[PDB]
Swiss-Prot record:
<dbReference type="GO" id="GO:0005654">
    <property type="term" value="C:nucleoplasm"/>
</dbReference>
<protein>
    <recommendedName>
        <fullName>26S proteasome non-ATPase regulatory subunit 11</fullName>
    </recommendedName>
</protein>
<dbReference type="GO" id="GO:0005838">
    <property type="term" value="C:proteasome regulatory particle"/>
</dbReference>
<dbReference type="GO" id="GO:0005198">
    <property type="term" value="F:structural molecule activity"/>
</dbReference>
<dbReference type="GO" id="GO:0008541">
    <property type="term" value="C:proteasome regulatory particle, lid subcomplex"/>
</dbReference>
<feature type="domain" description="PCI">
    <location>
        <begin position="187"/>
        <end position="353"/>
    </location>
</feature>
<keyword id="KW-0597">Phosphoprotein</keyword>
<dbReference type="GO" id="GO:0005829">
    <property type="term" value="C:cytosol"/>
</dbReference>
<comment type="similarity">
    <text>Belongs to the proteasome subunit S9 family.</text>
</comment>
<dbReference type="GO" id="GO:0000502">
    <property type="term" value="C:proteasome complex"/>
</dbReference>
<keyword id="KW-0647">Proteasome</keyword>
<comment type="function">
    <text>Component of the lid subcomplex of the 26S proteasome, a multiprotein complex involved in the ATP-dependent degradation of ubiquitinated proteins. In the complex, RPN6 is required for proteasome assembly. May act as linker between 19S regulatory subunit and the 20S proteasome core.</text>
</comment>
<dbReference type="GO" id="GO:0006511">
    <property type="term" value="P:ubiquitin-dependent protein catabolic process"/>
</dbReference>
<comment type="subunit">
    <text>Component of the lid subcomplex of the 19S proteasome regulatory particle complex (also named PA700 complex). The 26S proteasome consists of a 20S proteasome core and two 19S regulatory subunits. Interacts with alien/CSN2. Interacts with Prosalpha2 and Rpt6.</text>
</comment>
<dbReference type="GO" id="GO:0043161">
    <property type="term" value="P:proteasome-mediated ubiquitin-dependent protein catabolic process"/>
</dbReference>
Length: 353
């Protein structure tokens, strides 16, 4: 009757905490976290850790205000130190690092990350270490430090090479690798591969990250000038399933590429604002995607001519003439176009390629 009534209390605490979460009662849930503390000592350190972790997670999905969220985390941490519950403290610190990242609180995510890593590296069971090295990578990347983002991910992968990681950890690792090979726009081909691995590992387990990975497969293909592969990849028995605005956006960008049309590229970006410019990773690449679309559309217009007025080219792409003349001279200077400009009579001569 006593091992049982302790079990029923566990259920009850979680049920009520879950209810406070759904009804949006943050303060009530904060109090429940404090009030349950003595009860936690009549159960194993591990049962208690599950329980505390579960409530704190509930608290952090409530939009309570970064300030109140970070303070609640520090309090449970400080409590965990004051109780010598080590594994629990460490994993509450890991959660808080995740919170700092999510909240754009980057330098404190690093500061806390550095502390925790010193401990975690001097211990067995490396699963948590992977998590923290991956967060370190994610946060260096957000701070625009690719060397240190790559180096943190390398550590994560090497640590994960030892363990047999669950698919969501593997997926997330394959997703960062993809993000980082693509970040400097130097290796979209291997980035594509990592995204494909990520997609395969996430599929039927986490369908939001599966969708993200597929999306980035398509992005890579586009960036590679291989945008005609996009229809085949989408058509595939498994991809079909993932229909929606995200895939429609990439398909629409792929079409713009195919038609070498800046106007269609612009119509995509603003029809699919949420799926394109608001995707931190697509956004990172739209600048150079724009250049390529501009260039390809200009090639399309020039193609029928051995000699063409710049005014004609500018009217066709519906852009002011100085911009178009500037683009053309740059394309010629960087050997992207085999031709020459008569700047005074406004003519571009095109060489027999």
């Amino acid at each position: 009757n006593d091992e049982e009534r302790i079990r029923i209390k566990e259920q009850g605490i979680l049920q009520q905490g879950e209810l406070y979460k759904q009804e949006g009662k943050a303060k009530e849930l904060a109090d429940l976290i404090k009030v349950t503390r003595p009860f936690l000592s009549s159960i194993s350190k591990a049962k208690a850790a599950k329980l505390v972790r579960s409530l704190v997670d509930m608290f952090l999905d409530m939009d309570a205000g970064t300030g109140i969220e970070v303070q609640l985390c520090k309090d449970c941490i400080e409590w965990a130190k004051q109780e010598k519950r080590t594994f629990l403290r460490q994993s509450l610190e890991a959660r808080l690092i995740a919170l700092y990242f999510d909240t754009a609180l980057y330098t404190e995510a690093l500061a806390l990350g550095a502390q925790l890593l010193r401990e975690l590296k001097k211990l067995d069971d490396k699963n948590l270490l992977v998590e923290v090295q991956l967060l370190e990578s994610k946060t260096y990347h957000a701070l625009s430090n690719l060397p240190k983002a790559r180096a943190a991910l390398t550590s994560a992968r090497t640590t994960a090479n030892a363990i047999y990681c669950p698919p969501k950890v593997q997926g997330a690792l394959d997703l960062q690798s993809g993000i980082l090979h693509a970040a400097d726009e130097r290796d979209f081909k291997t980035a594509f591969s990592y995204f494909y691995e990520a997609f395969e590992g996430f599929d039927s387990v986490d369908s939001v990250k599966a969708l993200t990975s597929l999306k980035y497969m398509l992005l890579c293909k586009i960036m590679l000038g291989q945008s005609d592969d996009v229809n085949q990849l989408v058509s595939g028995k498994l991809a079909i399933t993932y229909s929606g605005r995200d895939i429609d956006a990439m398909k629409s960008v792929a079409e713009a590429s195919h038609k070498r049309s800046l106007a269609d590229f612009q119509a995509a970006l603003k029809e699919y604002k949420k799926e394109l410019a608001e995707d931190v990773i697509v956004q990172a690449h739209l600048g150079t995607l724009y250049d390529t679309m501009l260039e390809q559309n200009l090639c399309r217009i020039i193609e029928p001519y051995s000699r063409v007025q710049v005014a004609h080219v500018a009217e066709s792409i519906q852009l002011p003439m100085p911009q178009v003349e500037k683009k053309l001279s740059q394309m010629i200077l960087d050997k992207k176009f085999s031709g020459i400009l008569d700047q005074g009579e406004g003519v571009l001569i095109v060489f027999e390629e």
